[PDB]
């Protein structure tokens, strides 16, 4: 096949062009994102019951929905929350490979049939069935600087004038408003209602009557009276539009004549739908838009479009309103792309420098400069065809491949330059012999490297999806590199390279290049004389090999393992958790102090602090909040001291002083869906209707037992909230019937006033919006206010709430968890330093088995996938081994010789582990793939040395020691050129300090360190491996 | 106070070891939360017998009442903690204590139908003719609940 | 034919009919299933000790087994050879007439007194300035 | 039922339309609201798009809008079907 | 009476049912037992 | 093209004075002029 | 209609390049392809 | 696929006759089907 394209250089050039065009076309069309879809498909059912407690929501909504999630395809597990804010979330997680659309509609359909079973108020509010996605492209903050607008006033403007336009922007998949659009708020006065003998029931009745769309008909509607001239639509009563119109709603007319209106018994204003959240951006009132990236869209183009749209909205903004960008990933993705393209170009530049340093002609230096881009472009075309996107994992996946791509180019050219130098053959016939010597090995190498990388894709779960991105990327890149090496580079070598005289190794030149040739030629003789002595005493190097193997195994076990290294993203989170039962005001005072610290003492680093009061990842409520700290440019924060981790740990130490609040900062993970390696996720289930308290005790029993093993388990804690004080108010039925007060009027008056009640819709400036009746703040605060609410009896007299009610304090859950349609309690925790997850889980299972009868357990999230997909690791490793051995067995036509090649693995791995352990990095994916590329190239080098050595013994009938020394001499130069080029090429990534350095450090260090050993050792060791194996079995 | 909050949580949880340390350090045994529950209220509610005994020995108010007027004897009697009910009554718990609703520990013990506690409360001189705001005796609850055994004891 | 798409198209049309169906027919829950008419297997459940009756065993199977089996991937339909328990009010007409009452009054009373109410919160949002108390209000709950 | 184009557009059409953002292979979206009370929002998709998957993606996005709609509109019902604009034939019926 | 979903694998579905029943057995009340009075999969598994 | 509309305005305060419910007004106008769908019936074995 | 017209230049462009490269590979030449492909205008004018 | 040589027939009310008239029509068909043992066997309704 090389012989075919040596005679047909144009055919090769045609193939080169076709690949380049396809690749060029692919680069333009290929989607751009930070990370691809990794986590399995999940569908979140979300609803709201205004005024409802945790139990009420659970026993009316959560249980009813959970019961009707039957006959759905590829469902793994189903978790649910039910909290005292009146919210419920049911997250249905599906099998890795399930169509997220089919999964959503199947959930959405089965819910629709369960909608008639839910309460009227829950049907009214609605139930939202959405596909889970935490990965935002960017958060656009909207703030008021002149203090003319409240947070509710901003949120409305964003909902009306911005959101719809940002939604219609090119490449936007979903938009989420932080806050609600206006709602017609009727703040009822109980003293006024009692004065005119009225109730919230009358207010609700009056609003539904006087704010409604009434159907009428037509003048001259069909069937008409023959001879009709006019046919016009009759318009009757429509929905109200203004606060003034709601104010003039007639409630009652007295005998004297004077009229009772809704403004006489309540304050009216355009407020928010709920007041649970208080959003602030450096103290100033704030809202925002949570923008997500559409399927197969370009993050960079999407971002540019959003900004271009926001820009032409600015002229219409009210005085004080400004746009801010606290969270944006596209700045990071810009650098990710630029730094990778900079590395791939510098790589080819260094190959040119190295190629010219040794070979010393410009016709040789061009062939790799042509061949490498052809493969790189071709790779993009194959990944575009496979439906992959330009992301951090696929980008660094190609940086890792550089080693393999550069070698295939160098190996072919060097071997032609060598054959011409030693035999004095013309370029065309020299290439025919050159390719004749390597073509067999390169086809072998393809199948061997395939056997290394392909099995990496077959891993399951979230971790397995990340490995698949690196796998297909490297295999595709490597596959074309071998194809290009058998088609293009042979043709180029046959045409471009000039002849070399027999024996001319350029020792008879002058200057620098004259010195270098005599320097290297005598260094080659030192090397062969050196290996000569090594191959007399092979015994001691088999001992030195076992020292490396023990050295490797030692460092492997005592290197901390992770999934991805934490990056400086330019932002970080700061949690604020107050004691349970604390108010919204208390939490604000802490967030004000948190916001103050950052803008005061970290003023050089911090740009803004998005103080979100009321929000908490592990439960909502007044007594929780988060501060989203946004930093300045990477260049403006010099040194490690001014990076996120340094600021994080300084802030945590500072906020430990704060009196009554669990305050601490933490950096954001690269991908949020993985969690932490060593960490586990345990669900404690109620398997025989024991109730809440009995599961609370069983949890406390397990948490107490887990605490008595600090050597195995650490940070073992419940994910949920603890039971809190609640105001139980029993309505006396006899006393109510005796006075003639209906239970509907009582339960409505209590529910509408204290909890709020969504009555119906109204149209504010041509936009449908909600109408909520509720008690004015000061009449729904303390238990004393209960008695100030009067309900009208059948006889007509007004009865106070005290007259027919009794109250007491009890404890109940403000957030009730469930797992697979059974009451659950999620327990998080991690394996102690040195211990694996497998050990930690196995103990948690043992402790769980000695809990009271009726209490079961199960594993969810990362632990569920680790339990199943984690067991595949050895079975793939096994298959890889068998295929690699089989491939080498076919190449060499020997069951024994393959062993000589397979003994090279530790030589590359030991160096990677030294560099990592030295620097203080982790056993992450960038490092783990970093090994396979270092292992792959060291194996590739050995495969050629063994092939050359073998072919000399077979064809030219040489001796073992003779053939081995001859082989290693010929392969010395191309191994050094590849290494010198690659080690220099990956050097910038190692020393990198700026943005996205954590990944570059993980990629670079694990390769550079490994390559140093792989090069230095293999040149001395592979000779030994071949001799010892050839002796043992022959 | 600093320790006052840690005692409320420890008394609620049932951590005997932490209470002992806080009693030595000098934690306030009259330290109330927002609703007005002393550590005795928490221990009485969640049924932690030793802590109830430990707090009482450390001069804890046995007749302490919350913002709605309910005492630890109410909570102990209502949730059927027979052992704790006895200990409180011995240390001088008011058996005829009325909350803001006029409900006594006897009314609560009768409603959940804790036969053994009703006898103990009666033994310590509980007013059986005691009425709530709705004019309901312990007997009125027993016949409305349909508890024949309880009704016979109240006779 | 794609059975997944067949279900979606059939239900799309059923959703237009669902409102026109009676209130009682909706509250029993209409089901759209894509299963083979013939039975795959029967999972029998018995009490060897004879501690539980035919009705008790059926209740447990419906309450603590059926749901999880119905959610299992590949399970098109699950028929319960029995019935889940329900709070039966067995009415006496001689006694209803005596106190001047009807089944209507019984249904009206149960709806009023067996109800889970949303009663709001103390110190709920938006609160007053200088509030320290925040606790959920619990009115009537479901009967057990 | 018994709503004018203006009222229908504000309460139904715009509510549905602003929930029909970011759907795979959408070319354009035409819609109309009349004085009888009818809405018809037609989403045309790219050539070669799986029409059944398109229908599912639309149905899913519509049900977020469903509860924001008026109570009367939900009771009347909302359909999500694959639609052609022109008739294959007209089959007339007469009485001789 | 479990009926196979349209186009689903009988043996694989049956296996998943047994896995789910196996998690319920430990939390059964005293005396309760599972019996298998009808099953078409045992034929398909053995016959092959 | 834009059509003329007959905008009828119900005086609810004046209606309350005469002692008529606006429900009866809305139904009387709606049913008479527009037509009202009361329920179904059976015309030769078919629901209409 | 406009889509058909907007992609027409791109369609002819690549079609020519492909036919050129196809001939270049087959006959192992740059002269033979370029010698042939100069015929295209002689045909196109006839169609126009 | 069904039994070796069995058939599944549907008798339709095409003109909204009613249940009674469809029952009589069925009885007439079952009566005539019964007196051809040489051709038809065990012809019966599936309903009650
Ligand atoms: C929408 C799309 C966007 C636009 C994209 C544009 C893509 C353009 C693709 C077409 C590229 C074609 C380039 C042709 C180069 C021809 C150069 C020589 C021409 C010539 O007639 O001379 C021949 C000798 O040339 C020789 O020396 C032959 C030896 C081998 C030459 C190889 C080097 C040429 C490099 C070409 C690739 C560079 C462009 C990369 C895209 C004699 O002809 P002959 O018939 O006597 O030959 C004997 C073979 N038996
Ligand atoms: C089972 C398993 O994990 O196989 C892996 C791991 C593997 C068995 C490796 C082949 C071979 O070196 C193995 C030996 C005996 C090599 C000699 C020593 O150093 C041992 C301490 C070492 C143990 C594991 C190791 C390192 C594997 C291969 C073969 C890949 C071969 C080449 C040429 C790259 C594989 O993964 O396919
Ligand atoms: C999966 C394949 C494996 C990786 C292959 C190699 C990856 C490295 C090459 C990626 C370069 C191509 O990616 C391309 O980058 C250029 C940068 O000018 C972007 O171009 C964009 O630049 C800026 C960036 O904000 C925008 O304002 C502007 O609208 C647009 O011109 C393209 O939108 C993107 O598609
Ligand atoms: C710094 C650690 C990282 C480096 C890792 C690489 C290790 C290899 C270093 C280069 C080894 C070459 O060095 C080579 O050693 C062998 C011993 O085995 C010597 O060999 C000499 O001693 C042996 C043993 O007595 C005799 O059998 C032999 O006849 C004699 O020549 C060679 O004269 C020397 O040239
Ligand atoms: C299935 C593994 C493939 C290994 C590659 C074998 C190539 C042998 C080539 C032999 N040769 C024809 C060049 O003499
Ligand atoms: C945005 C690019 C999408 C590519 C779809 C699949 C390409 C296949 C090429 C044959």
Numbering used by the authors:
A (entry chain B): 1 to 1034
B (entry chain D): 12 to 166
C (entry chain A): 98 to 241
D (entry chain C): 50 to 145
E (entry chain A): 290 to 337
F (entry chain C): 722 to 769
G (entry chain C): 866 to 913
H (entry chain A): 674 to 721
Task: Paste lines from the article.
The E. coli AcrAB-TolC drug efflux pump contains the inner membrane H+/drug antiporter AcrB comprising three functionally interdependent protomers, cycling consecutively through the loose (L), tight (T) and open (O) state during cooperative catalysis. AcrB is the homotrimeric IM proton-motive force-driven H+/drug antiporter component which recognizes and actively transports multiple drugs (antibiotics, detergents, dyes, and solvents) via the tightly connected AcrA and TolC channels across the OM, leading to an observable resistance phenotype. Four different entry channels (CH1–CH4) have been described with putative entrances from the periplasm or the outer leaflet of the IM toward the two drug-binding pockets, the access pocket (AP) and deep binding pocket (DBP) inside the AcrB pump. Here, we present 13 X-ray structures of AcrB in intermediate states of the transport cycle.
CH4 transport-compromised AcrB-Phe380Ala shows binding of FUA at the lower end of the TM7/TM8 groove proximal to the cytoplasmic side, surrounded by TM5 and TM7-TM10. This implies that FUA may enter via CH1, but also via CH419 and is in line with the observed substitution phenotypes. Since β-lactams and FUA have been shown to be transported via CH4 as well, we realized that the c-loop may play an important role in drug transport not only via CH1 but also via CH4. We therefore compromised the entrances to both CH1 and CH4 (Phe380Ala_Phe563Ala), and observed indeed a strong sensitivity towards FUA, β-lactams, and the failure to grow on DDM by cells harbouring this variant, whereas wild-type activity is retained towards doxorubicin and rhodamine 6 G (R6G), presumably transported by the unaffected CH318. In sum, the results suggest that CH1, with its TM7/TM8 entrance groove, is the main transport pathway for LMW/LPSA drugs, DDM, as well as FUA and novobiocin, starting with binding at the TM7/TM8 groove and peristaltic movement of the drugs to the DBP. β-Lactams, DDM and FUA are transported independently via both CH1 and CH419,25.
